[PDB]
Structure 1
Amino acid sequence: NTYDLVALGVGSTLGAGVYVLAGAVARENAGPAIVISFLIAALASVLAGLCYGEFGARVPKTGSAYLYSYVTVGELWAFITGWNLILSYIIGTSSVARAWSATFDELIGKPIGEFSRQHMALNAPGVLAQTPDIFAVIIIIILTGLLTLGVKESAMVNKIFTCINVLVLCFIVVSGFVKGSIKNWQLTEKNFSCNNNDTNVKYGEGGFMPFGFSGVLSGAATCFYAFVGFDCIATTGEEVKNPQKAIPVGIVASLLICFIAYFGVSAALTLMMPYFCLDIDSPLPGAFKHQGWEEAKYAVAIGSLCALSTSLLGSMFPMPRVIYAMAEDGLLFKFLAKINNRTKTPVIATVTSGAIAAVMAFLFELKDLVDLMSIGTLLAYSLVAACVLVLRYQPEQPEKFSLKSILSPKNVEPSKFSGLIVNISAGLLAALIITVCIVAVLGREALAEGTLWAVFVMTGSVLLCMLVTGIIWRQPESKTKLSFKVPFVPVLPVLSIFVNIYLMMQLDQGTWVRFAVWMLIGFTIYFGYGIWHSEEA
């Protein structure tokens, strides 16, 4: 049964993440040190997964983090989680359509792509895609037509596509270890000449870590989105033979298998061809071509187009479903809630989300969409971790204080006073890790210089973080039995939030601006319309 749990996890986790991400990271953010970027992103994911195990344990009905938040924590928190999940699905659809279109375009040939270069130009690389992906828009419209018609993901074909994906991954790893050479992890100025006449290349230092540990951290922040999919283990639904013991082993084993796959594939990619000469549109096939195994481009083309499909469909199928769920609850506009009588599907929500994903794929680069999805997913996961941390200390439902009551409560089970102090402590602690990450990222050079203000704020914030975590620790936990519990509930959720926020802070200013605008639209919808028409009103 544990074997089945780990299988479910590996299957649910996207297998197309490395095909599109490996090149973009290994060329723009990390080098061969992407091998390490995948590791950190794995660990950051594991901390999240364990929390999900408890979160899905707190609600007997299986569902998304939206439903769990709405039942447990309330309207606003659930709205924010669902809106982040909407962004994750929409932008994941956009990114996977980008990847699939790029792969097919390179396979068919550049002239097919060069039609866009002839007839279209956004002309704003910084805030707009250097090249619009019209064909990804065509893919998204086709798939939205299929989903509106009622076409649904097929289990058997998905299994077949996952098997072919894993076989091609094994072939890629074997070919990397056969043809690849360690010299590509030791490149110097002597090897800083690329055969193709491609300009504005980011040579960097060269070697194994050309862009430094900050580049490794930015890649890990960008690689966090690839490990998404382990939720299905926490939300398994079926009964488990040893829940709090089988669920965590399954989650960790699935994430370790995914890390092994990504490590092997990125290692092969960065060993066969120089990191700075990687093809962002299609890294793996071009890397094969560089080594003279050009025929392999077809095999990868067979695998990649399958794997990306299993990703795109996976993102596309639930994208309307969250919109429908929120619209029924009144959080989102009711016109999305309506379901066609002919299709028995939420046609309007599917069409709207498809159009948004198509626009995002058209106007924005692959890395921009990737980082926007990463920031949204990291915010959602940090919110889930905070939700578990808070709920562990609230009393089971049907201000002034004293230092003795705060530091040494004598009650054996959570009182409402204990719940309020834990709520306040969680809020203060969240703000304080935000400050810690700000100083560690914006004040990073200031910290290296040892300037008094930066070191003072850092030390004070870290010590007060420890103190707030301790005050949470001192409060009694809920005696309620759960099918799963995060082991170190005072520490592990806090470390999860810390890692998630730091990874978010690694993302570019453009990603933060896009995310801020998205959250602003979400809050405008909620405060202007959602509150008043909520079905619980």
Structure 2
Amino acid sequence: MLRRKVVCLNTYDLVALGVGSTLGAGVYVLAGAVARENAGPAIVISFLIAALASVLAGLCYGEFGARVPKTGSAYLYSYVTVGELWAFITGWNLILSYIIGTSSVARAWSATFDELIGKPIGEFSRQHMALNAPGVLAQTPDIFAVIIIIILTGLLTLGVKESAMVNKIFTCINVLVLCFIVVSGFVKGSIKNWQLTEKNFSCNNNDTNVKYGEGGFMPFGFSGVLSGAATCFYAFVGFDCIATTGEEVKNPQKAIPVGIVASLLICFIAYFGVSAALTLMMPYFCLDIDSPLPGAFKHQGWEEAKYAVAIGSLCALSTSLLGSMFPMPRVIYAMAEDGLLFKFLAKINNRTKTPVIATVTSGAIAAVMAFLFELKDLVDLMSIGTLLAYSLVAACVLVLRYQPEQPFSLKSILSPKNVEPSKFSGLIVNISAGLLAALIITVCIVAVLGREALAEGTLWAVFVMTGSVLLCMLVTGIIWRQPESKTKLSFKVPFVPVLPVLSIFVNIYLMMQLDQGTWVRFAVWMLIGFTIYFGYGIWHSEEA
């Protein structure tokens, strides 16, 4: 099941596109939630970790898009290079990423707008609607998010495309608002909010069930910081639009990686500054559940600034929302045309010259997801899928670096005399990659499920941990000794035997940091995808 397919914007334009597609909905809404529940004032470190992993992923994309001339989503590159099943998994994960990102950003947009106008829509929803599933479904069904998704799907079906000028304007407004937030945090905020103790564990409001934690800079510990990093990984998603951009690029394979990295660095700087401001102006446990940044501004007396923020957020979210919506029908259409998904989804309509059916179906799914589930649950469900997709791309890069160009003894495996990759070396690298992926999954399982056991130093946990880590190093060395393909690439991952492996490890660890419900939702989604592939994908594949 590995059939393989037969295959101007400047750097600044790509940077602007990535920044516009990444900044919103992760800093304006989820930053406060992470700083209150998962990370505390140490959320600054979380954004760092989520940044680094993201950068690694981006670097993989730089190579992963360099191996294929036709610019497109990671699904296209996988289906061209590695095969059909792998590409289907990657495309299905990207579909989940786009759908749940649309749902979550629509939730954030609806919540922000409703809060701005005094939360009348929330009162209406609570009055006339109730899901009666508090443990899984959302307390308040976001009807306005559904309306937003319906309107935007209607616009997309009619042929509305990426307006670069409007994106640039909104990104400039967003960046100005973020700079204002950082400056106001460093002016009004104080370091004492990072040094809170039991004396200050008293919010001036009358909130109940407050989590005060240890206090200080890291109230919830490094486990909390890691959970916050896993949640904040959602904030760095969106740079894919750089590589998948429809418009022709002046220097595609050279500008795409630099643009992705620069966008990620700018987003990391913005997130660090804004989160430090948010946690310095207001105590982490005092952060408002609904409007963290406006709540912090009101706490320090600059309540009027809530309007300015209300502007920037509503800009950023918009630029993020479309950033999640435009790719959403494209990947589905690409997969349906290739036969992996139902062929009817590939029917471009003559009235509009757009994939009407795919757009409508994806929009309806996103609207339902936004109607039924909370913002945090959607964020985690998108993060797990995006992490899996990035790990898949990193594994593709690692494997393909050692495969021979398209047409035994222990010493031979350890020391391959061949100057260039032979099919034996390619098979060795494939086996090593599979073993390393399984072993990294085992390491993360022991490091999370057995985290307390490792802290307790039980014999079995330590034995498995040391064995798995040493064998991971051994397999990485096995891959290292294999010759790399001499096929010249415009962009390459610097340390191909280590960097992709580290990217996979960090990604899988972050996925392990996610909750059980997120894993159950991801498992049922993957079951649906596998059912579709094995029942329809294999037999109706276009390349069959």
TM-score range for the pair, normalised by the shorter chain length: over 0.9
Contact 2:238 2:323 in 1 (8 A): no
Mean Cα deviation higher: 105-114 or 303-312:
105-114
Contact 1:30 1:215 in 2 (8 A): yes
Compute the displacement of 1:232 (Å): 4.8
Contact 1:53 1:485 in 2 (8 A): yes
Change (3 A) 1:18 1:509: same
Change (3 A) 1:61 1:127: same
Compute the displacement of 1:243 (Å): 8.5
Change (3 A) 1:11 1:100: closer
Contact 1:6 1:253 in 2 (8 A): yes
1:91 is aligned to 2:100: yes
Cross-structure match for 1:456 = 463
Compute the displacement of 1:259 (Å): 0.8
Compute the displacement of 1:130 (Å): 1.8
Q: Distance in 2 between matches of 1:245 and 1:140?
A: 35
Cross-structure match for 1:120 = 129
Mean Cα deviation higher: 447-456 or 402-411:
402-411
Q: Distance in 2 between matches of 1:236 and 1:139?
A: 24
Cross-structure match for 1:409 = 416
- Report the TM-score, using the length of structure 2 for normalisation: 0.94
Compute the displacement of 1:5 (Å): 5.7
1:23 is aligned to 2:51: no
Contact 1:331 1:534 in 2 (8 A): yes
Residues 45-71 of structure 1: CA deviation (Å, up to 9, x unaligned): 111111111111100110000000000
Q: How many residues align?
A: 535
Mean Cα deviation higher: 13-22 or 102-111:
13-22
Q: Distance in 2 between matches of 1:137 and 1:2?
A: 35
Q: 2:429 aligns with which of 422, 426, 430?
A: 422
Compute the displacement of 1:277 (Å): 2.1
Q: 1:154 aligns with which of 153, 163, 172?
A: 163
Compute the displacement of 1:222 (Å): 1.1
Change (3 A) 1:458 1:412: same
Residues 183-241 of structure 1: CA deviation (Å, up to 9, x unaligned): 22122222222233332222222221111100100111111121123335556799999
Q: 2:64 aligns with which of 55, 59, 65?
A: 55
Q: Distance in 2 between matches of 1:240 and 1:118?
A: 51
Change (3 A) 1:317 1:242: closer
RMSD over aligned CA atoms reads 1.9
Runs of 5+ consecutive residues of structure 1 not aligned to the other structure: none
1:257 is aligned to 2:266: yes
Contact 1:56 1:235 in 2 (8 A): no
Contact 1:53 1:235 in 2 (8 A): no
Mean Cα deviation higher: 376-385 or 199-208:
199-208
Residues 34-90 of structure 1: CA deviation (Å, up to 9, x unaligned): 111000111011111111111111001100000000000010000000000000000
Mean Cα deviation higher: 186-195 or 356-365:
186-195
Q: Distance in 2 between matches of 1:112 and 1:496?
A: 42
Q: Secondary structure at the match of 1:164?
A: helix
Mean Cα deviation higher: 504-513 or 403-412:
403-412
Residues 473-527 of structure 1: CA deviation (Å, up to 9, x unaligned): 1111101001111111001100010000001110111111111111111001001
Cross-structure match for 1:283 = 292
Q: Distance in 1 between matches of 2:259 and 2:172?
A: 20
Change (3 A) 1:13 1:361: same
Q: Secondary structure at the match of 2:65?
A: helix
Percentage identity across paired residues of the two chains: 100
Q: Distance in 2 between matches of 1:241 and 1:352?
A: 34
Residues 353-388 of structure 1: CA deviation (Å, up to 9, x unaligned): 111111111111111100111100000000000000
Compute the displacement of 1:11 (Å): 4.3
Q: Distance in 1 between matches of 2:84 and 2:254?
A: 32
Residues 231-265 of structure 1: CA deviation (Å, up to 9, x unaligned): 35556799999988876554433322211100111
- Report the TM-score, using the length of structure 1 for normalisation: 0.96
Contact 1:59 1:68 in 2 (8 A): yes
Q: Secondary structure at the match of 2:41?
A: coil
Mean Cα deviation higher: 408-417 or 147-156:
147-156
Q: Secondary structure at the match of 1:480?
A: coil
Contact 2:254 2:490 in 1 (8 A): no
Q: Distance in 2 between matches of 1:256 and 1:439?
A: 32
Compute the displacement of 1:12 (Å): 4.5
Q: Distance in 1 between matches of 2:116 and 2:12?
A: 38
Compute the displacement of 1:157 (Å): 0.9
Change (3 A) 1:239 1:127: closer
Q: Secondary structure at the match of 1:203?
A: coil
Mean Cα deviation higher: 249-258 or 507-516:
249-258
Compute the displacement of 1:13 (Å): 3.2
